[model samples]
Target: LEWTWVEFTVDETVDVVVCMMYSPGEFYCHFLKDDALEKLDDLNQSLADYCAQKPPFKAEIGRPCCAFFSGDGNWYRALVKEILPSGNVKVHFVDYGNVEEVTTDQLQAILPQFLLLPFQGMQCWLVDIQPPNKHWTKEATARFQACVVGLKLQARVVEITANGVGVELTDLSTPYPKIISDVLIREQLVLRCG
Candidate 1:
């Protein structure tokens, strides 16, 4: 249907909606949270699967790789999952979230232009990093952004949760791996605590 509400106590102002991204809040229905999360997990599974499989990547977890969707004789973008053996690696299709094993031969690296596309949205949070109630001041936000973005980075997880993993990003390209979180804490930009 074009529009529908999966209701809650049948209230007027508080019901889950399904209207093609009508309002972002529609997915916040209490009962539909996970469903919404999965649904919102809804970005570009189809095209990505097409591009990476029929298309191809180097095998790496959380990093985008192309794999064969042999079922349809195509390629799609997928995140590396299991590194089974020499020939086989399990991949989670970036947009779709389906995990499948493809030989390393089918893997192809994604280049710069396509890097700006839909298949890259993996939900991750900074480990235990939060702002004060006053929130990130402009300087704080800029310092944080300037430090974090545009880095060839790696993460080591300190916390894990059902929804997302808490990670600290360290730029491998920097001097002895500069971690943005540590940088922020050192610069007094963001607080560090568990």
Candidate 2:
């Protein structure tokens, strides 16, 4: 039997061609490549696995990190106090003096460039640090406060400029916060980001 060619417009600059059977609406659709079908199945399984498990850089209990709070739309410096079994972390804000339990999906890296991969859809995921004074002397202790996080810390003013104040941390051990990884694999019985 001779097949009839039919073209359907799905979107601009894109069209789909299919062969019909005895009826017009009945169309034949099959895998053109076996590898493509395997790849799609693999991708579907991978997505199911991805959605089943938690995102990276959400662990590292007792370490210092930053998290994005949607209420104020700011990333706050927090210390990982506890890692809940549910994959949620209990954090204690360094300067904020508040303890809140948050999920790994709700946290971000401290550098501002490293946003939590769990939550996407923003261009810039950085903390805007503003200093108090314009002219600052090096080795001078300055108190800086975050506008959104509502936290303050005293660091030696290393450099001062029109752009911002560069502060030098005396305690280099815990100065830079890191989003550590959690390595535990199992059957995902709970919901994603649990």
Candidate 3:
């Protein structure tokens, strides 16, 4: 099970959630979480096992670390990404054959709407930190040469030092209508996850 950070495209319109990262030689399931976080590990294993039973069909994102059947009857991305504390993790879900047909520049163009939904034809993922206006800023940008983009920055979440304003972003691309008032049921889930 070779694990490495990569950037590519997925043709299918699917939802992706950001998980944890291990050390240079840590197992995918052995993150910093305790038994309480085992639910995530269990979910990943179950999804992988489920996909193993599928017939050999080509995948836009290849064999993801995790997978599942969406309520809409479409497949979604459930890849478990391992990223360095400072580097960004860019994940694109494109049909295997359509890879690179759309460049990052193209996806950046509609970054916002994509950032607002679970799936977009193309999108970007970004994470950055700059003091003075520190905040974990994530937004899909316009198509550069031809691709979408997003981000998950330090200010967004608790800093590495465990000090500073932190924010948690869970696939901001998907939106959830509020059950009451303007509070979102889905966004509330994100908060719970954090």
Q: On residues 1-194, what C-alpha lDDT tens digit does candidate 1 reach at each position? A: 01122212211121122111111111111222335435433423544554544443456566666667887866665667778857688886654435687888777775554444433223345555556444665676666456544333555545544443345556667468676677777777667666
Residue 177 of model 3, lDDT score: 21
Query: Best candidate, TM-score-wise?
Result: 1
lDDT (10s digit) by residue, model 2, range 1-194: 01111122222121111111111111122112224334434533443343344443645866656654556655555667888779788886542335688878777545332221111100111122211244222211111111112222223333333322222222223566321101000211111222
Shift in Å, residue 33, candidate 2: 68
lDDT of each: 0.50, 0.34, 0.24
**Ranking according to TM-score, highest score first:** 1, 2, 3
Candidate that beats the other on lDDT, 1 or 3, i.e. the better one: 1
- For residues 24-140, what per-residue lDDT tens digits would candidate 3 score against the true structure? 111011111223234433543543454454333212332332223333332233332333243322333321101222212211111122122222112222213121223321221
Which run of 10 residues does model 2 get worst, by summed lDDT?
117-126
Per-candidate TM vs. native? 0.38, 0.28, 0.21
Model 2 CA deviation exceeding 4 Å by range? 1-58, 112-194
Scanning candidate 3 in windows of ten residues, the lowest lDDT window is 23-32
TM-score of 2: 0.28
